Design an enzyme around this catalytic site. Structure first.
Site, PDB file in Angstrom:
ATOM      1  N   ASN A 107     -16.882  41.877 -41.992  1.00  7.35           N
ATOM      2  CA  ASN A 107     -18.204  42.488 -41.981  1.00  7.35           C
ATOM      3  C   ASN A 107     -18.252  43.572 -43.052  1.00  7.35           C
ATOM      4  O   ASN A 107     -17.533  44.572 -42.967  1.00  7.35           O
ATOM      5  CB  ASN A 107     -18.524  43.069 -40.608  1.00  7.35           C
ATOM      6  CG  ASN A 107     -19.928  43.662 -40.538  1.00  7.35           C
ATOM      7  OD1 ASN A 107     -20.300  44.517 -41.342  1.00  7.35           O
ATOM      8  ND2 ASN A 107     -20.710  43.208 -39.571  1.00  7.35           N
ATOM      9  N   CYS A 145     -26.388  39.170 -42.974  1.00  7.83           N
ATOM     10  CA  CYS A 145     -27.163  38.310 -42.096  1.00  7.83           C
ATOM     11  C   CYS A 145     -26.376  36.956 -42.090  1.00  7.83           C
ATOM     12  O   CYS A 145     -25.195  36.959 -41.700  1.00  7.83           O
ATOM     13  CB  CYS A 145     -28.595  38.198 -42.643  1.00  7.83           C
ATOM     14  SG  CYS A 145     -29.564  39.771 -42.610  1.00  7.83           S
ATOM     15  N   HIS A 160     -27.632  39.845 -34.231  1.00  5.84           N
ATOM     16  CA  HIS A 160     -26.250  39.379 -34.309  1.00  5.84           C
ATOM     17  C   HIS A 160     -26.219  37.939 -34.807  1.00  5.84           C
ATOM     18  O   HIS A 160     -26.790  37.047 -34.167  1.00  5.84           O
ATOM     19  CB  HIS A 160     -25.571  39.498 -32.943  1.00  5.84           C
ATOM     20  CG  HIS A 160     -24.083  39.338 -32.984  1.00  5.84           C
ATOM     21  ND1 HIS A 160     -23.297  39.919 -33.958  1.00  5.84           N
ATOM     22  CD2 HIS A 160     -23.237  38.658 -32.173  1.00  5.84           C
ATOM     23  CE1 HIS A 160     -22.030  39.607 -33.742  1.00  5.84           C
ATOM     24  NE2 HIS A 160     -21.967  38.843 -32.665  1.00  5.84           N
ATOM     25  N   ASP A 179     -17.455  34.783 -35.366  1.00  2.00           N
ATOM     26  CA  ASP A 179     -18.167  36.050 -35.291  1.00  2.00           C
ATOM     27  C   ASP A 179     -17.474  36.990 -36.264  1.00  2.00           C
ATOM     28  O   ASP A 179     -16.658  37.822 -35.864  1.00  2.00           O
ATOM     29  CB  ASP A 179     -18.144  36.585 -33.883  1.00  2.00           C
ATOM     30  CG  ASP A 179     -19.090  37.746 -33.686  1.00  2.00           C
ATOM     31  OD1 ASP A 179     -19.552  38.325 -34.688  1.00  2.00           O
ATOM     32  OD2 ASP A 179     -19.374  38.072 -32.524  1.00  2.00           O
TER      33      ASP A 179
END
Ligand SMILES: COC(=O)c1ccc(CN2CCC(O)(Cn3cnc4c(-c5ccc(CN)cc5)n(C)nc4c3=O)CC2)c(Cl)c1
Ligand SMILES: COC(=O)c1ccc(CN2CCC(O)(Cn3cnc4c(-c5ccc(CN)cc5)n(C)nc4c3=O)CC2)c(Cl)c1
Lengths: 338, 335
Positions: free
Chosen positions: B8, B13, B254, B271
């Site tokens: 991250n 997005c 998320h 994720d």
């Protein structure tokens, strides 16, 4: 609409920014002084003071979520991750330094130090010789350690705890040579608006870059701080009222940032979630952000001194915005509407 | 799981999701490795940045970074990715690599994998004129509002539209005419990228809003009846490979992706840096939406018959030695 307060647009990975902006906006004395800054000659492209005036104006007047692009442009944080590489207190200092400097020479010069600046002593006391060094320092914010502590009180106890300088960390006492000493801080003043950041990450080699400490950490609605003053004062004890709770949920800079506030200091709380502002319970604003007993918790607290509450949160009317400022922003909005 | 995650590093997005989705397009990955990027500027080259991300996803034990990539295609602002759909970013990447593959032994890999063909017809009602024109496509945008499932979305997509009244069709001789327009699929590619129209303009306000309505999609998707003409030896049967999911109401929500990378029904959730094995129900039915606001906005299907080829194994040998040496030296310099 519902709550009487409007929200801030989500427009990027600005992390703590919308939280801090709402927190500053509801520092009514600050908001008013910001409205008084003489920005008529300012370049609307470069002026951080004008950009904050614009944001505060919209937060006061707009029915729709307020945008912040001109603001981030004005202080130059525009990259995908420029906010990830700064703590919330650095953004606060950028904003407050800009507007403080802009207030020089005006009727509101010194508002920022009056509201946010306190003073502390740092000492080194030699144990085996007679030598002490004292250094009075201003502070605008306090970083409190939470790892291993249960509450704000234990954090403050840790903050003023004496540290021993012995063995391989003996103190250079000049002509006395290397000496065993003790080193610590004491608070001299606590400001009317108290910004506390909780140390919720840690850069350790064992954890590579940074992990989020999600441990439970309790803060009260009413915080008494007299016992951490070098010298208390009976006509104004250091009793503080919880005003804002800035909260992060998750583990990374992609987590969810929100802020809880009771803007009047009256215990009636709202949650500010970007564009969505909702009424909430006291329990949701305070205890629920203590942390798992599970990764939603407070990283920053704003307290106001009881004795300064009515002035810090003094009402703001539309008439408090000078006419020139109002017409300049109204013309911005008409130019956009065309 | 045997698969590594992606760091991250911003409000990117869909990017990480798309990246995993393209990395596990094994045939695409192999062709990406073959691009002749030895003379490329390590700062300018989107093809090199994709090669580098893919290589790291294949080897690294630690979450993989993406900064040289986003720099390569110049999406570096706070809200770069908020202002583009996922299919625009996919097209940026695929156009870059396809162009780099021109005149190479893998020229044409991108159209072969992702490019299908439809016919667009205009048929006049009161006169005898029909216009047929082939259009190409790399992705399909399916309307979901008021659609129960993918099947109804495809039925809506091929539905006839009336050109009447004051939008009559200006055919060529017969003058302005009342006609009807439509599309039929001529061919469906081996890899089918389907974006679902999960945002819409809401009249009650004046913003784009997110449709969180329930929308069903199957593990196996038969598409024969949407072709102009079917092929009895190769029916258009597709298998679900990827489910790119958004949970929330806004670009601060998320983003995750679910994949069964080997086409074997063993599903994992990606994720960012966390890659976790998961149930089939959590990848599929749990992302249908309805009233969390967690749901699929993009689906990747692979033609059953093409499955084993698209997901052909990729080994360390498949990465040319010159590229390996370049990236190794790159991380040596990082010291
Ligand atoms: C990689 O993904 C993550 O792990 C992760 C990502 C985002 C967040 C949330 N954001 C954390 C930072 C924030 O600025 C609050 N904040 C501020 N200052 C801090 C200092 C500190 C102490 C002393 C000094 C010297 N005077 C300077 C700084 N320390 C040790 N921790 C913090 C801290 O948390 C705002 C919220 C978290 Cl919690 C984890
Ligand atoms: C308040 O709302 C929000 O803040 C919100 C923020 C993020 C998201 C999630 N992200 C949505 C966009 C995404 O790119 C998926 N995607 C892609 N293309 C779309 C088109 C479409 C149709 C036709 C054409 C012409 N050929 C072009 C585009 N339409 C109508 N909708 C979409 C769509 O959802 C990736 C994920 C959502 Cl769902 C809501």
């Amino acid at each position: 609409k519902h709550t009487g307060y409007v929200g801030l647009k989500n427009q990027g990975a600005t992390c703590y920014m919308n939280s801090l902006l709402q927190t500053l906006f509801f520092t009514n004395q600050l908001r008013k002084a910001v409205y008084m800054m003489p920005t008529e000659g300012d370049d609307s492209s470069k002026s951080v003071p004008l950009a904050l005036q614009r944001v505060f104006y919209e937060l006061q007047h707009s029915d729709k979520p307020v945008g912040t692009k001109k603001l981030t442009k004005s202080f130059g944080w525009e990259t995908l991750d420029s906010f990830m590489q700064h703590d919330v207190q650095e953004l606060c200092r950028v904003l407050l330094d800009n507007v403080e400097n802009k207030m020089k020479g005006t009727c509101v010069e010194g508002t920022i130090p009056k509201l946010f600046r306190g003073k502390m002593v740092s000492y080194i006391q030699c144990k085996e010789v007679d030598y002490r060094s004292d250094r009075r320092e201003d502070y605008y914010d306090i970083q409190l350690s939470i790892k291993g502590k249960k509450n704000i009180f234990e954090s403050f106890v840790d903050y003023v705890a004496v540290e021993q300088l012995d063995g391989d960390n003996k103190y250079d006492a000049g002509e006395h040579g290397l000496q065993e000493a003790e080193k610590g801080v004491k608070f001299l003043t606590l400001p009317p608006v108290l910004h506390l950041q909780l140390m919720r990450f840690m850069y350790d080699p064992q954890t590579d870059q940074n992990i989020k400490i999600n441990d439970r950490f309790e803060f009260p609605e009413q915080l008494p701080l007299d016992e951490f003053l070098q010298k208390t004062d009976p006509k104004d004890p250091a009793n503080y009222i919880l005003h804002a709770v800035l909260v992060h949920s998750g583990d990374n800079h992609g987590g969810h940032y929100v802020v809880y506030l009771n803007p009047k200091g009256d215990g009636k709380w709202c949650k500010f979630d970007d564009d969505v502002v909702s009424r909430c319970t006291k329990e949701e604003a305070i205890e629920h952000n203590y942390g798992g007993h599970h990764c939603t918790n407070a990283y920053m607290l704003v307290y106001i001194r009881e004795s300064k509450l009515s002035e810090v949160l003094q009402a703001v009317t539309d008439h408090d915005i000078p006419q020139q400022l109002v017409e300049r922003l109204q013309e911005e909005k008409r130019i956009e509407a065309q």
